[PDB]
Structure formats: C-alpha cells, structure tokens
Amino acid sequence: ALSLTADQMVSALLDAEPPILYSEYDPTRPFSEASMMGLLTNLADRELVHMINWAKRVPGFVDLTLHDQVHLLESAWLEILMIGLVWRSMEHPGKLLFAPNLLLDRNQGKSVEGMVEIFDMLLATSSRFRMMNLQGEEFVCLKSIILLNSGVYTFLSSTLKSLEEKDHIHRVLDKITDTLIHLMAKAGLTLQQQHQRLAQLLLILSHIRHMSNKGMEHLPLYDLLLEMLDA
Amino acid sequence: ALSLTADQMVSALLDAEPPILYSEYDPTRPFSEASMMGLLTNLADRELVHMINWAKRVPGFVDLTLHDQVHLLESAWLEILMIGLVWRSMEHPGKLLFAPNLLLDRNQGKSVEGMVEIFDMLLATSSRFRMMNLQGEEFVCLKSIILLNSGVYTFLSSTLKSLEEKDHIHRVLDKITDTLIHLMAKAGLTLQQQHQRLAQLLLILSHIRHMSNKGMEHLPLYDLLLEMLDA
Numbered sequence: 001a002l003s004l005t006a007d008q009m010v011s012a013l014l015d016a017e018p019p020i021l022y023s024e025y026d027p028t029r030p031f032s033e034a035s036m037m038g039l040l041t042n043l044a045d046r047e048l049v050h051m052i053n054w055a056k057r058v059p060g061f062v063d064l065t066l067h068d069q070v071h072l073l074e075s076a077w078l079e080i081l082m083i084g085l086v087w088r089s090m091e092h093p094g095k096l097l098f099a100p101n102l103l104l105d106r107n108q109g110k111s112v113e114g115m116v117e118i119f120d121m122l123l124a125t126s127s128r129f130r131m132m133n134l135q136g137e138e139f140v141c142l143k144s145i146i147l148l149n150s151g152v153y154t155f156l157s158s159t160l161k162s163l164e165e166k167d168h169i170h171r172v173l174d175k176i177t178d179t180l181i182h183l184m185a186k187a188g189l190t191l192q193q194q195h196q197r198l199a200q201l202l203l204i205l206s207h208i209r210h211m212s213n214k215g216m217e218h219l220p221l222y223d224l225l226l227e228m229l230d231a
Numbered sequence: 232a233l234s235l236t237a238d239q240m241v242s243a244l245l246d247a248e249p250p251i252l253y254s255e256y257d258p259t260r261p262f263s264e265a266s267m268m269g270l271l272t273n274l275a276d277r278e279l280v281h282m283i284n285w286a287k288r289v290p291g292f293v294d295l296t297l298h299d300q301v302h303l304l305e306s307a308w309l310e311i312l313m314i315g316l317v318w319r320s321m322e323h324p325g326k327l328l329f330a331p332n333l334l335l336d337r338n339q340g341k342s343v344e345g346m347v348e349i350f351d352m353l354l355a356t357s358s359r360f361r362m363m364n365l366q367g368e369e370f371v372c373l374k375s376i377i378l379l380n381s382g383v384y385t386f387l388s389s390t391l392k393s394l395e396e397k398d399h400i401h402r403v404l405d406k407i408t409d410t411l412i413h414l415m416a417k418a419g420l421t422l423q424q425q426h427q428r429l430a431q432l433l434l435i436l437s438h439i440r441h442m443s444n445k446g447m448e449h450l451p452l453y454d455l456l457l458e459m460l461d462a
C-alpha cells in the first residue's frame with residue numbers, strides 16, 4: 001500500500017479502471033421524447049455499481065473502515081462520474097460522450113431546466129483537459145485523489161480511529177502525488193514545470209467539486225452505498 | 232508582474248492584506264436576540280469592499296478586463312471570506328473568530344436553520360490548518376490562487392481576448408505556485424515534501440469551494456462588484 005512503487009501505483013489504478021457503459025436507449029425510437037434526465041439517471045445508477053468495484057481496488061481504500069469507505073464515496077460519487085465524463089469527452093469538442101451511443105451537444109442540454117448550465121461547465125472542463133493535454137495515467141491519479149480527498153475533511157470526529165484513518169488517507173494521497181510527479185518527470189518536464197502542472201491539475205478538482213455541487217442541486221445514498229460496499 | 236521574484240510576490244501579497252474588521256454589535260445588549268445572520272451579513276458586506284482593494288493589489292489582477300475582474304470576484308468572493316475566517320480562527324479550537332469581538336463556538340451556530348452544518352465544516356478546515364501548521368506566507372498565496380482560479384473555467388468564451396486572459400491568469404497562478412514551493416524549500420522541506428505539501432494545500436481549496444457552495448445555498452452581485460471595481 002504505502003510501499004507501492006510509482007509505476008506500480010499506475011499499473012494498479014489503470015487496471016482498476018471501470019468499464020465504459022452504454023445508455024439503455026432504444027435506437028429506433030424518436031429521441032425528442034426519450035426523457036433526457038431519465039437516460040442520464042439510469043446510466044449513472046449503473047456506473048455507480050462499477051464505481052464501488054473500482055474504489056475497492058484503489059490502494060489503501062479497503063484498509064479503511066466500512067463507514068469511512070461509505071462516507072468517502074458518498075462525498076465523491078458525482079465528482080467521479082463527472083471527471084470520467086469529461087475525460088471521455090476530451091476528444092469530442094462541443095459534445096459530451098455520456099456513453100458511446102449517447103453523444104450530446106450543447107443544444108441537447110436545453111432539454112431540462114437549468115441543465116445547459118451544467119453541460120457548459122462540463123464542456124469547459126473537457127476543453128481545459130484538451131488544453132493541458134492530460135494523459136491517461138494523470139487522469140486515473142486524479143480520479144483516485146478525488147475519491148480519497150473529497151470527504152476527508154468532513155468526518156467530523158477526533159476519535160483515535162478517525163485520526164488514524166485521516167492519517168492513512170493523506171498518506172495514500174501523498175503516494176499518489178509522488179506518482180503524478182514521477183510521471184511528469186519521465187515526460188521530460190523540469191522540476192518547475194512538474195510543480196506548475198501538478199498545481200494546474202489539482203486546481204481543476206476545485207472546479208469539479210463546484211460542478212458536482214451544482215449537479216447535486218439540480219439533482220438514503222449512504223445505505224445504498226453501504227450495501228454495495230459491505231460484501 | 233510575470234517577472235516578479237518569489238520573495239517579491241510574498242512581500243506584494245502580504246502588503247495587500249485587508250484589515251481585520253469588527254462586528255457592529257452593541258456589546259451592552261443581550262446576545263440571544265442580536266440576529267446571528269444579521270451580524271454575519273453586515274460584517275461580510277463590509278469586508279467585501281476591502282476585498283476589492285485587496286484584489287486590485289494582487290499582481291496581474293488589474294491587467295485583466297474589468298468584466299473578467301468582476302467574473303473572478305463574483306466566483307470567489309465567498310471562498311475568500313471563508314478562507315480568511317478559517318485562518319484567523321486557526322488558533323481558536325472549537326471557535327470561529329468572525330471578528331475580534333465576535334468569537335462564536337459550535338452551539339451558537341444552532342441559532343439559524345442549517346447554519347451549524349456550515350460552522351462545523353469551517354471548524355474542520357480551521358483544524359486542518361492547525362494540523363498542517365500553515366504559515367502566513369502560504370496563506371496569502373492560497374487566497375490569491377482562489378481569486379484567480381475559482382472563475383477561470385467559467386468564462387465560457389473562446390474569443391482571442393478571452394484566450395489571452397485565461398492564458399495570463401494561469402501564468403500568474405504558475406508564478407504563485409513557484410512562490411509556494413520557494414517558501415517550502417526555504418523552510419527546509421525536501422523536494423518530495425515540497426510536492427506533497429503543495430498538493431495538500433491546493434486540495435483543501437476543493438473543500439473551500441464546497442463550503443462556499445453550501446454557503447451560497449443557505450445564503451445583482453455583478454453590478455455591485457462592477458461599481459466597486461470600476462473606479
């Protein structure tokens with residue numbers, strides 16, 4: 001876990017990658033009446049299941065407490081669905097690849113009230129990824145950081161156990177930071193460029209947190225998540 | 232601007248620091264009827280004015296477009312008020328130093344509906360700052376990063392001007408990253424520790440974004456901000 005090598009962390013995360021699901025939409029039926037929200041909703045609910053399997057495979061995650069594992073996913077679930085959406089949409093300018101059979105552009109967002117706001121923020125993030133030429137290895141590191149970071153400041157506890165957990169989460173996270181830098185070092189970037197790029201990458205996560213928040217508004221999960229985790 | 236030296240960036244930001252305002256509350260009147268929200272509201276509205284002066288003094292900020300300057304403050308205003316609150320509350324465990332004459336603890340939050348949620352998140356952030364032993368120089372760098380970063384992904388424009396602006400904002404931001412590292416290098420931290428600490432610092436900003444979002448819910452600003460900026 002905390003002994004994992006940089007290259008081993010990347011092989012470990014890359015291997016943990018979830019599958020790219022398809023939208024359960026009837027291709028022969030008129031789209032102008034498919035219920036946009038309904039499609040996205042059913043899609044996300046199915047990815048959530050695979051998200052758990054993925055999370056269980058992120059180094060150090062299963063070491064935590066079941067209830068801590070739930071808390072973290074409960075805080076990050078939507079941010080992870082989003083950063084994943086933005087990634088696969090990276091090479092699709094002006095469009096969002098929700099699923100191989102569900103590629104929507106701006107206008108298609110004006111379907112539901114206030115959904116075009118969220119699409120634009122997503123497209124913009126996708127665009128930034130294009131601008132930075134984000135790499136698949138950098139991507140998985142970021143998605144793992146989101147998972148371990150998003151809920152680590154809201155355990156609201158100072159018990160010895162919560163203290164060892166928080167400690168352990170920031171130790172894995174540090175490992176991921178080291179890994180990100182390693183990648184950038186190998187790409188040829190100087191020390192300065194490594195720091196600057198690391199910062200540019202982490203700061204985009206603030207934007208993903210914000211999008212998630214807007215998404216939560218437009219949109220118990222704990223028990224649902226629990227049952228999936230506790231196998 | 233983009234030529235500023237590390238030590239010059241810190242002297243520049245430290246000098247730009249706003250004043251620590253007081254709550255306009257009658258000390259001889261019973262507090263159980265002072266209207267908690269009213270106090271906080273009037274306080275923030277006054278700090279906002281000083282926030283503009285401060286922003287105008289952040290290197291590279293005034294170089295932007297007035298409308299870009301407004302957009303950035305409109306996106307970050309509450310996050311900045313919050314990171315400032317958390318900072319001055321750092322040495323006050325279990326309490327929030329909203330102002331020298333307004334130090335409130337947990338329970339005092341149960342005043343308004345759902346306000347104790349926000350206080351707890353704030354206390355937790357303050358606690359993390361204590362855990363990391365954040366330094367005044369690191370603090371100002373972070374507050375400047377928030378200002379330039381929070382709204383840089385939502386300009387929703389690809390005009391040449393918007394492209395040069397975004398470019399220019401990420402160039403100042405990189406300067407601040409270099410500065411943060413410089414500080415950590417001088418503190419004695421190794422290269423590895425520098426990277427890890429930079430990451431831990433930036434990631435807390437995601438949490439500040441989240442708190443701001445919750446704060447915006449519980450809670451035009453553009454025109455208001457405009458008038459203050461355009462002097």
Ligand SMILES: Oc1ccc2c(c1)CCN(c1ccccc1)[C@@H]2c1ccc(OCCN2CCCCC2)cc1
Nearest residue numbers: 040041043044045047048081082085118215218219
């Ligand atoms: O990979 C995916 C799949 C779907 C989505 C994204 C990524 C990001 C943007 N997004 C969204 C979020 C809010 C408003 C509009 C769109 C959709 C989305 C996300 C979540 C969602 O949830 C429906 C409720 N559902 C109930 C069971 C537990 C899981 C959540 C419904 C749609």
Ligand SMILES: Oc1ccc2c(c1)CCN(c1ccccc1)[C@@H]2c1ccc(OCCN2CCCCC2)cc1
Nearest residue numbers: 271272274275276278279312313316349446449450
């Ligand atoms: O330095 C300060 C001063 C006040 C506050 C913070 C920091 C952070 C937490 N916080 C808050 C935010 C939402 C809910 C509860 C508390 C208060 C706060 C923040 C903003 C606020 O705004 C009232 C509306 N006001 C109208 C004019 C433009 C500026 C905004 C009222 C209270």
